[PDB]
Design a binder for this molecule. Sequence first.
Ligand code: HEM
Ligand code: HEM
Ligand SMILES: N=C(Nc1cccc(O[C@H]2CN[C@H](COc3ccc(/N=C(/N)c4cccs4)cc3)C2)c1)c1cccs1
Ligand SMILES: N=C(Nc1cccc(O[C@H]2CN[C@H](COc3ccc(/N=C(/N)c4cccs4)cc3)C2)c1)c1cccs1
Ligand SMILES: C[C@H](O)[C@H](O)[C@H]1CNc2nc(N)[nH]c(=O)c2N1
Ligand SMILES: C[C@H](O)[C@H](O)[C@H]1CNc2nc(N)[nH]c(=O)c2N1
Ligand SMILES: [Cl-]
Ligand SMILES: [Cl-]
Lengths: 362, 362
Amino acid sequence: EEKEILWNEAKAFIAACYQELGKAAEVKDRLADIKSEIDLTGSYVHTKEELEHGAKMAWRNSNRCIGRLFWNSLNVIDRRDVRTKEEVRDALFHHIETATNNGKIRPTITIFPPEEKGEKQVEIWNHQLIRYAGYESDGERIGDPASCSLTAACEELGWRGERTDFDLLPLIFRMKGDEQPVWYELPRSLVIEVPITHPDIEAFSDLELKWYGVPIISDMKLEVGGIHYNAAPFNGWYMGTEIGARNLADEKRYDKLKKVASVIGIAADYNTDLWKDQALVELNKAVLHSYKKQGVSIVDHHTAASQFKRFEEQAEEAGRKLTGDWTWLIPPISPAATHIFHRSYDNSIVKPNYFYQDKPYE
Amino acid sequence: EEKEILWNEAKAFIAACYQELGKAAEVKDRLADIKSEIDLTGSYVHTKEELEHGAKMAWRNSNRCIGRLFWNSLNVIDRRDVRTKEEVRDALFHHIETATNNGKIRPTITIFPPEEKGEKQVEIWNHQLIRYAGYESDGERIGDPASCSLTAACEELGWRGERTDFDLLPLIFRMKGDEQPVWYELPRSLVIEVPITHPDIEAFSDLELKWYGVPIISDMKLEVGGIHYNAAPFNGWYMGTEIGARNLADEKRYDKLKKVASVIGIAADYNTDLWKDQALVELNKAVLHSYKKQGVSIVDHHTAASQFKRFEEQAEEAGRKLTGDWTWLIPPISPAATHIFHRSYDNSIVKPNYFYQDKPYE
Ligand code: HEM
Ligand code: HEM
Ligand SMILES: N=C(Nc1cccc(O[C@H]2CN[C@H](COc3ccc(/N=C(/N)c4cccs4)cc3)C2)c1)c1cccs1
Ligand SMILES: N=C(Nc1cccc(O[C@H]2CN[C@H](COc3ccc(/N=C(/N)c4cccs4)cc3)C2)c1)c1cccs1
Ligand SMILES: C[C@H](O)[C@H](O)[C@H]1CNc2nc(N)[nH]c(=O)c2N1
Ligand SMILES: C[C@H](O)[C@H](O)[C@H]1CNc2nc(N)[nH]c(=O)c2N1
Ligand SMILES: [Cl-]
Ligand SMILES: [Cl-]
């Protein structure tokens, strides 16, 4: 059955990919080649062109992503050649450096060898390559609560965090044939961070907030034509609300709205004062201001929704069905101020695509 | 078939309603009575108790409503006795007066005779009993664009609006056996309105904004045990975001955000300044302030979501399945600041319930 699933996914992907690349005449011979290879080896190997376009298609098909206008300019780094943990580590360091690009962020994906018989070759434990640790013990909470379980797993392996609110987690991944993952501290010279200040309110720096420049999701599987690339970290740039309305605001994250209210000089006593809403707006203005001031790419939710509108228009004009998840596409600040809120989207799953996979710890 | 649909809906409703009312022993005899009545007359008549509880159940089952905690205190006015257009008009005037209650709004529904063979006895044309007219001609737009088609229909019937931005539409409804609806101007003494001022920003009154106190939805069908009450206007009080984030803010409604930005002293030039978000927050603070200052009931979205949380808890504790439409329950301002955003809801349709029906004009 698994070989049949593979062959069916291969046929659909190769046909679609080659149509898009103006290579339709080559589909027949390529499919034959693939079928022989599946018969003989149990799998097949993508050409560099297939792999690159497949990763782009997968972004284009990501229903929850507002940033899809730029799908065709994804920078795809092919690292199916890695075999050692030093090679993996250096590939991840390189991804950080090249994606960061001195602040002018380049959307990038690095693709490692795919699962073989559902057997991973490289298993990355980080949720993002750059992320802050979290600690909770005896009612004492430090750092990012979303990272508590991974932080605990790292400290099981001999890592020790300084227990600031912004400890950088090490890279942690496991190689096929190894029982335990290895970990490596991130060189700080590779990691851009942005202190959060407000354009008008000088006291805002008293909160001593900061965030990292580049979100690099490293725990999703890229599936392309039936091949499962479980290790394929990718990044774009942030939309400001991710940081200002969620990472720094959620009660189960950094939970900063009361502190924000205080530094902006408003009471946090009455729901009818909409102090949470006002604090959210100022924190979000500060996040955008701060990234811009430092020359680190970021997009605000209005501009992002406008770009997404163009993505919708582009899909229609290309004759492609548009899919989307309305519940994730609306921003968490002023959603009804965007066109997204006012239309609906078909949430059908189309492949290639990026998928959740089980965490190797917890 | 229609008689069978009726009987099946009747059986389900009577069983459920009588269980809830501790009247389970009476179900058998009541069902027999109903079956004879359907056989003989083609329909059946609700007892006052059934009608009242049915309207409450319908509110409780309204997936899109955040205000459902208070479902059991709905004030149900039984007007199945009306036969004349003067009686309908006076019933609607009465609903306005008693629901308004000098500003201390009472959630109320007035129930008119139900459809017979799908034949309406009373057909209400208004979307809400109190609503502003809208005009569009030669690029000139006045009032509420959402009311343009109903406004045009009224002016076909001899009504003429003053063409302020806040003309009150007349009540307009049609009686069975009449070819044209009749209309009646609303007595202004029945209609409470609230001028919008801001707690801190004196210039806000320069915008000369106002809204009406009581939203009374008059174009939905109440369906209870297979009986279709197409005319059954109901009201609660507003959640402030309905007015501040939508009615006054939407580009296709009063479109006031640029004017708000100007009076609050901020530039409306750059998306990254989040001026729309800031204007939304201040307009919404003003709406809540203004209703409170005037002693007209209103709820803010934080308090409303907290009440809705209790509704969820109440349903579980009563052993009732909860249904909801996440896309409507989240407020359009700071949705991720409410618990609603962070959970999911089963959007299954359960009856009794309120349903859209086709507009008799357009
Ligand atoms: C270029 C700038 C980009 C922006 C501004 C952007 C924006 C976003 C945002 C705001 C989310 C929702 C995140 C959340 O609420 O947790 C998201 C989800 C997503 N984005 Fe993008 N994105 C960009 C690039 C990319 C790239 C390069 C990829 C992959 C190649 C990608 C794939 C996805 C996926 C898979 C999700 C959904 C994750 C999930 O289901 O949990 N995006 N994007
Ligand atoms: C008591 C105060 C109430 C509050 C604060 C409240 C709040 C709301 C809000 C904010 C909406 C969404 C409206 C929109 O975005 O257009 C809504 C929808 C709704 N409410 Fe309530 N509500 C209340 C009472 C009632 C009552 C008394 C009923 C009926 C007996 C009712 C039935 C509904 C229905 C049917 C909808 C959905 C309308 C549609 O599908 O278009 N509500 N409610
Ligand atoms: N069953 C599961 N559900 C699950 C568990 C924990 C978190 C979770 O959320 C995703 C949502 N979202 C978070 C990641 O997605 C993101 C996050 C940020 C993001 N932001 C950006 N601007 C970009 C990052 C990379 C390219 S653009 C874009 C996508 C993380 C899902 C599991 C999957 C794996 C282990 S358990
Ligand atoms: N196919 C249709 N879809 C349609 C067309 C126009 C508008 C529309 O929206 C509903 C949404 N929503 C608006 C009414 O619902 C509301 C509006 C306000 C509201 N606010 C409150 N606080 C209350 C009013 C009454 C009790 S609480 C509560 C419910 C109006 C739906 C049609 C149905 C009828 C003719 S075409
Ligand atoms: C297309 C989308 O479902 C539509 O804009 C909805 C979204 N959620 C909403 N939620 C509420 N409460 N009211 C609305 O009018 C809408 N509009
Ligand atoms: C339950 C609900 O679907 C969940 O809270 C979602 C809602 N929409 C979201 N949208 C985005 N972009 N990111 C999120 O984490 C969430 N959370
Ligand atoms: Cl993030
Ligand atoms: Cl309204």
